[PDB]
Design a protein around this ligand. Structure first.
Ligand code: GDP
Ligand code: MG
Length: 169
């Protein structure tokens, strides 16, 4: 039915692949830890409507990607992931948002700010820090753990709903 093109961006090590694999796993394969960018597919019903999600798991700003610009052109919505115990990854979110704005020539791009690894007791980026950053961008903030699966489905579903809302403006 309705297809959505989703792109996961963020610094290396924050859990982009772990979040994506947790979403798309059919668990035929026990463990899967990709190291190269790839695209994954998931069919899911969101608010009664069957959605086909294509999810691009990008690499950090350091791993070269020839098709990076084209991925951002094709992408309809972006998960901007940082880790709640890595302040640099949180500061890097500005860089990733600027790249997307540079390619798409818009400040009005569907995005969700994702604070991953919320299963950890120790944390260096506070909830209000991230909620304030999300406010400054006009985008939702969601805390996730690819370990406990907390918030993982909701992060992606929230992004789909952001894309729908944008398409109806
Ligand atoms: N505690 C915790 N560790 C995580 C979580 N998500 C990912 N990791 C770990 O962080 C490391 C990097 O994860 P990875 O998925 O490769 O991150 P990527 O580079 O952003 O794709 C791996 O060792 C994972 O085990 C999480 O939600 N909680
Ligand atoms: Mg990865």
């Amino acid at each position: 039915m309705t297809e959505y093109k989703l792109v996961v961006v963020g610094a290396g090590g924050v859990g982009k692949s772990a979040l994506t694999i947790q979403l798309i796993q059919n668990h035929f394969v026990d463990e899967y830890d990709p190291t190269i960018e790839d695209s994954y597919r998931k069919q899911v019903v969101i608010d009664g409507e069957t959605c086909l999600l294509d999810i691009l798991d990008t690499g950090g700003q350091e791993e070269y990607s020839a098709m990076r610009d084209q991925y951002m052109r094709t992408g309809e919505g972006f998960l901007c992931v940082f880790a709640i115990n890595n302040t640099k990854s949180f500061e890097d979110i500005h860089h990733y948002r600027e790249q997307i704005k540079r390619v798409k020539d818009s400040e009005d791009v569907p995005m969700v700010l994702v604070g991953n690894k919320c299963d950890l007791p120790s944390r260096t980026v506070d909830t209000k820090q991230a909620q304030d950053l999300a406010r400054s961008y006009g985008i939702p903030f969601i805390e996730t753990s690819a370990k406990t699966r907390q918030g993982v489905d909701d992060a992606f579903y929230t992004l789909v709903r952001e894309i729908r809302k944008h398409k109806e403006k």
